[PDB]
Amino acid sequence: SSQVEHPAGGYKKLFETVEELSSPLTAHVTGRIPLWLTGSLLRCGPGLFEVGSEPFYHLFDGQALLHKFDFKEGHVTYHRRFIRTDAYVRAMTEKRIVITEFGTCAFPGVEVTDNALVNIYPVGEDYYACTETNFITKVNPETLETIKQVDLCNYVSVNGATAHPHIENDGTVYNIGNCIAYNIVKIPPLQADKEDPISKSEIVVQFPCSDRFKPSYVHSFGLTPNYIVFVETPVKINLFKGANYMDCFESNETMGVWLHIADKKRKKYINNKYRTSPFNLFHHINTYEDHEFLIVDLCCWKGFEFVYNYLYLANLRENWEEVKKNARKAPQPEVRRYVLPLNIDKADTGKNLVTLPNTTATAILCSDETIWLEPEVLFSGPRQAFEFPQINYQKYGGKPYTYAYGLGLNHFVPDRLCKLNVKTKETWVWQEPDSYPSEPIFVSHPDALEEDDGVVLSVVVSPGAGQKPAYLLILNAKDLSEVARAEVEINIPVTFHGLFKKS
């Protein structure tokens, strides 16, 4: 949890417009940048929160800004360019808001936003900035130049895809989108023919929907070597409904949460009716197989009200006492472990199927064949969210693991970095006053023997008058002890997701 209040209101600088750079800046290093840290921290976020006198209203509306911290021989540069999306280009052309964003209607067929402010991921030799629509934007990871807009609907049958695709070691990309059903998209690795892997995209498996005409909002999903896990939440999209995307969301009060598993290799939906209490879910932490059970670690919000209702910029820009009051009635954040039994024996009807020796998670087989799940709580703090979770993904993604790293939210304000041991539930915290960090990204030491042998990288906004406005933070992944910072002389707004590109 946080041990800090924010009366000075410095968090408002997260939601303030900035200018892009013409070329990279030098960043003043304090401490020692690891000499093995060679590559680029690439991150996406909103950078322009108004077009002249026309404001963007929601956190997910601001125009995509691509950030890069380059590391080489203990030296750091910072560069950023706005992504030349239809949304951005047409806004600069017409000097107004042209395309409707998540929570901001544009005034005068349907022009869906391509504002790729959320994440960036590799496909073959290419990198794509994304939002949660059918439009992803190919970007140059060295110059940050915008290359091309790609419409996924040209290639596969989905209305959109999440900003959280899973990426196997061979470069295979998995994603999910509604079409009502939910389709798993598989993009293969780059072949010897060297054609665009997106032109070889296919639907491998389909998940059914709880409502014939209303798909659940899906932000992320789980992947193991053998299984795909999809969590159907009571946050529903109502297509029937000057409207924006936010206006289409409603809460189903009665359904609670339905969990779904598919056989990855046999490409089959498994008709196991996993059920539990209502929660919002944005980020899966990790998923793995343990005997005949799937371990499903989730960042949950307890309730069926859409958490995005609390992320309007006008509310996030209020003074600290008003920010805390606004969050009082919001869903409570909680890290939960669910355990999904794969072998359901009818003889065990009415009993707990989770026979694993190291968990308090339960799965009750009911007479109607529904399997009622109770979680093991890994972390819980009052309006203290362990969010934007990251692991040692390359080596422990989809596999038994011990450690997760997170951004700590204090009434939705990011004010700390967190490490969670998911086996012992021990936590580590890094926190300084009037300092607002981003999602921590783990980079392994090249000679790593342990899971947490490496560093986490975070972009920190420090608007305190006796400090430079922002810096790149490097923590030791062992104990979250500071290793170095690279300070820059310009402000950096909020960033959501990113990756470390090794070179």
Ligand X SMILES: CCCCCCCCOCCOCCOCCOCCOCCOCCO
Annotated binding residues for Fe cation? 164, 219, 283, 497
Say how far residue 80 (Cα) sits from the centre of its chain. Answer: 20
- H and E: helices and strands count for the chain: 4, 36
Give the number of residues in contact with ligand X, rule: CB under 6 A. Answer: 22
- Which DSSP state fits 320? H
Q: CA neighbours within 13 Å on the CB side: how many for 430?
A: 27
* CA 52 – CA 353 distance, rounded (Å): 59
Closest separation between CB of residue 308 and ligand X, Å?
7
> Does 168 interact with a copy of itself (rule: CB under 8 A)?
no
Closest CA to 100 of 75, 149, 133, 71: 133
Q: Is 485 helix (H, G, I), strand (E, B) or coil?
A: strand
> Does 494 interact with ligand X (rule: CB under 6 A)?
yes
Structure tokens, 20: 């892009």
Q: Which of 22, 357, 426, 466 binds a copy of itself (CB under 8 A)?
A: 357
Q: Is 326 helix (H, G, I), strand (E, B) or coil?
A: helix
Q: Is 463 helix (H, G, I), strand (E, B) or coil?
A: coil
Neighbours of 289 (CB within 10 A): 16
> Does 210 interact with ligand X (rule: CB under 6 A)?
no
C-beta of 318 vs 432, nearer to a copy of itself: 318
Closest separation between CB of residue 70 and ligand X, Å?
21
Closest separation between CB of residue 194 and ligand X, Å?
32
Written as one string, the DSSP assignment of 3-37 is: ----TT-GGGGGGS--PPPSSPEE-EEEE---TT-
- Convert residues 407-426 into a mask of x (bound to ligand X by CB under 6 A) and - (unbound): x-x--x-x------------
Neighbours of 500 (CB within 10 A): 19
- Which DSSP state fits 331? P
Stretch that binds a copy of itself, among 181-189, 323-331, 463-471, 478-486 (CB under 8 A): 323-331
Q: Which of 60, 304, 396, 430 binds a copy of itself (CB under 8 A)?
A: 304
298 binds, among ligand X, a copy of itself, none (CB under 5 to 8 A by kind): none
Q: Which of 239, 366, 429, 490 binds a copy of itself (CB under 8 A)?
A: 366
φ/ψ of residue 248, rounded to 5: -90, -15
> Does 196 interact with a copy of itself (rule: CB under 8 A)?
no
Q: Which of 70, 114, 126, 132 binds ligand X (CB under 6 A)?
A: 132
Q: Which of 387, 434, 451, 452 binds ligand X (CB under 6 A)?
A: 387
> Does 118 interact with ligand X (rule: CB under 6 A)?
yes
Beta strand pairing call for 222-223 and 227-232: antiparallel
60 binds, among ligand X, a copy of itself, none (CB under 5 to 8 A by kind): ligand X
Say how far residue 485 (Cα) sits from the centre of its chain. Answer: 24
Q: Which of 172, 277, 402, 491 binds a copy of itself (CB under 8 A)?
A: 277
> Does 471 interact with ligand X (rule: CB under 6 A)?
no
> Does 406 interact with a copy of itself (rule: CB under 8 A)?
no
Q: Which of 73, 170, 253, 426 binds a copy of itself (CB under 8 A)?
A: 253
> Does 131 interact with ligand X (rule: CB under 6 A)?
yes
Q: Which of 359, 402, 431, 476 binds a copy of itself (CB under 8 A)?
A: 359
> Does 402 interact with a copy of itself (rule: CB under 8 A)?
no
Q: Which of 50, 196, 202, 348 binds a copy of itself (CB under 8 A)?
A: 348
> Does 133 interact with ligand X (rule: CB under 6 A)?
yes
Structure tokens, 467: 């400090």
132 binds, among a copy of itself, ligand X, none (CB under 5 to 8 A by kind): ligand X
381 binds, among a copy of itself, ligand X, none (CB under 5 to 8 A by kind): a copy of itself
Written as one string, the DSSP assignment of 240-271 is: T----SGGGEEE-SSS-EEEEEEETTTTEEEE
Give the number of residues in contact with a copy of itself, rule: CB under 8 A. Answer: 42
Closest separation between CB of residue 23 and ligand X, Å?
26
C-beta of 326 vs 476, nearer to a copy of itself: 326
> Does 60 interact with ligand X (rule: CB under 6 A)?
yes
Structure tokens, 416: 């700390």
What's the Cα-to-Cα distance from 271 to each of 182, 268, 287, rounded to whole Å? 15, 9, 19
Residue with tokens 């013409």: 22
Q: 476 near 416, Cβ under 8 Å?
A: no
140 binds, among a copy of itself, ligand X, none (CB under 5 to 8 A by kind): none
Q: 377 near 336, Cβ under 8 Å?
A: yes
496 binds, among ligand X, a copy of itself, none (CB under 5 to 8 A by kind): ligand X
Site for ligand X in 137-176 (CB under 6 A): 163
377 binds, among ligand X, a copy of itself, none (CB under 5 to 8 A by kind): a copy of itself
Angle at 282 between CA 281 and CA 288, to 5 degrees: 80
Which residues have a Cβ under 8 Å from the Cβ of 80 and sit 6 or more positions away? 18, 20, 21, 47, 65, 66, 67, 68, 144, 492
* CA 405 – CA 301 distance, rounded (Å): 18
Residues that bind a copy of itself (CB under 8 A): 251, 253, 276-278, 302-305, 328-334, 348, 350-362, 364, 366-368, 372, 374, 376-377, 380-383
Residues that bind ligand X (CB under 6 A): 59-60, 102, 113, 118, 131-133, 163, 219, 245, 282, 307, 311, 387, 407, 409, 412, 414, 438, 494, 496
